[PDB]
Amino acid sequence: TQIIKIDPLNPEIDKIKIAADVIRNGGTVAFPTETVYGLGANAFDGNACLKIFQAKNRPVDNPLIVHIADFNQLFEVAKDIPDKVLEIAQIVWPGPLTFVLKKTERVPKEVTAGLDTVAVRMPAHPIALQLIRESGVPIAAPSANLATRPSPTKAEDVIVDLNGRVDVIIDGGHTFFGVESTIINVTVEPVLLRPGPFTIEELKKLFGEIVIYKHYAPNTRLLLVENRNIFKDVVSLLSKKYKVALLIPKELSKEFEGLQQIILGSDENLYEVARNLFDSFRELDKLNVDLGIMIGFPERGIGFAIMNRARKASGFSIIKAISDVYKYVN
C-alpha cells in the first residue's frame, strides 16, 4: 500500500493525481472526508468496487455511498430526482448529507447491493472533492474500517486497519466531524435513515414532513448512562466489582479521578465529542478493563448523531434508572 501524505486544506494536486490514477485503473484508495475516512473505487467499475468489500470483509449486501464532485455526475448515477430535491441538493452540497435516490443503469450491483436505489453525497473536504475531480468518475465508498472496528477518523486508524489490503491510503489528518453523514431517503414521501452532522433541526426546515443483529465495536462491554443524575452512583456501584473505564467530558474528570478515563471532549462543544467518539471506542478495547461506562449527551444538533452511534456501540445497554444496571451486569 502506498501511503501518501496530503494537506487536507490545500491538497497538492500532483499527489492527488497519483491516487486518482489508481482509481481510474480500478484500484482502491482510502481518503479523508468531513465525516469519516472512506475506502473508494470507481463507482462505475463493479469489479473494482468488490475490492472494497474484500479489503473490509464487508457483507456483500451492505451498499456503498457514491461520492460526486459536481452535479453533472449526480445525473450519471441518479435519475427521476424531484425538483425540490435538486433545488435543496444545490444548497447543501458539498456537505455531510446523503440522499437515497433512484439509480441509473450505470450503477453496478456491487454499489447498490442490487437495490433499485443509490445513496449519493458530495463530500465537503478538499482532498475528497479533488480526488473525485481528478479521477473523472464518481467514487463509491463506505467507511474505511475493517468490518468489526469503529469508523476511522484519522490516518492511523486506516493504516492499522487496511495497510496491505488496499492500493493507496491518503494520510490527510483527522476528519472534521467524526461521525458519518446524515442519510435521508427521498424516493418515498422523506425518511431519516441515519442522523449525522447535518442536523435534524436543519433538515426539518427543508423537509418539514420528514419522518424520524450486527455487532458494533467496541468488543468490550459498554454501558450508556443517559440519565446524568445517576452517573456517579452507577460508577460507584460498578467500579466496586469491576475494573472500569469512563467515557466522559472533561468537565467530569475531577469527579472520578483515580479511575480509568477516556476524555471525549467538552460539554460546551459537542462537535469535539463527535470528533473523538469512534477513537474513544478503539481506546476502550486497547485498555484492559471489564467494561466501559459512557455518560449521555444532549440530543441537540450533532448530539443526536453522537447518541445514535453510542446506543449502537453499547449494544443498546441504556441506563435511565440505576436499577437498569441489573440488566447488563452482575
- Assess 292 for contact with ligand AMP (CB under 6 A): no
CB of residue 168 vs ligand AMP: minimum separation in angstroms? 18
Q: Which does 111 bind (CB under 5 to 8 A by kind): Mg ion, ligand AMP, none?
A: none
| Length of the chain counted residue by residue | 330
Q: Would you tell me how many other CB atoms lie within 10 Å of the CB of residue 117?
A: 19
Instruction: Decide: residue 83, CB within 10 A, 0-12 exposed, 13-18 middle, 19+ buried.
Output: exposed
Cα separation, 141 vs 38, in Å, equals 6
Cα separation, 277 vs 224, in Å, equals 13
Element (H, E) at 279: helix 270-286
Cell of 24: 481510474
Cα separation, 186 vs 264, in Å, equals 34
- Please answer whether residues 181 and 308 qualify as being in contact, where contact means their C-beta atoms are separated by less than 8 angstroms: no
Among 117, 130, 143, 239, binds Mg ion (CB under 5 A): 143
Alpha carbon dihedral 198, 203, 205, 209, in 10-degree steps, equals -170
Residue 305 in marked binding region: no
User: Which residues 6+ apart lie within 8 Å of 70 measured at CB?
Assistant: 122, 133
Size of the site for ligand AMP (CB under 6 A): 15
Contact flags string 122-151 toward ligand AMP, x per CB under 6 A: --------------------xx--------
Residue 143 in marked binding region: yes
- Name which of 93 and 231 has its Cβ closer to ligand AMP: 93
Considering only the stretches 58-66, 231-239, 249-257, 286-294, report the one whose residues sit in contact with ligand AMP under the rule CB under 6 A: 58-66
Name residues contacting ligand AMP, limited to 81-110 (CB under 6 A).
100
Among 22, 43, 77, 118, binds ligand AMP (CB under 6 A): 118
Report the binding-site residues for L-threonine: 35, 67, 121, 141, 181
| Residues lying near ligand AMP in the complex (CB under 6 A) | 62-65, 100, 112, 115, 117-119, 142-143, 180, 183, 193
Report the binding-site residues: 35, 58, 62, 67, 117, 121, 141, 143, 151, 181, 194, 216
| Residues lying near Mg ion in the complex (CB under 5 A) | 142-143
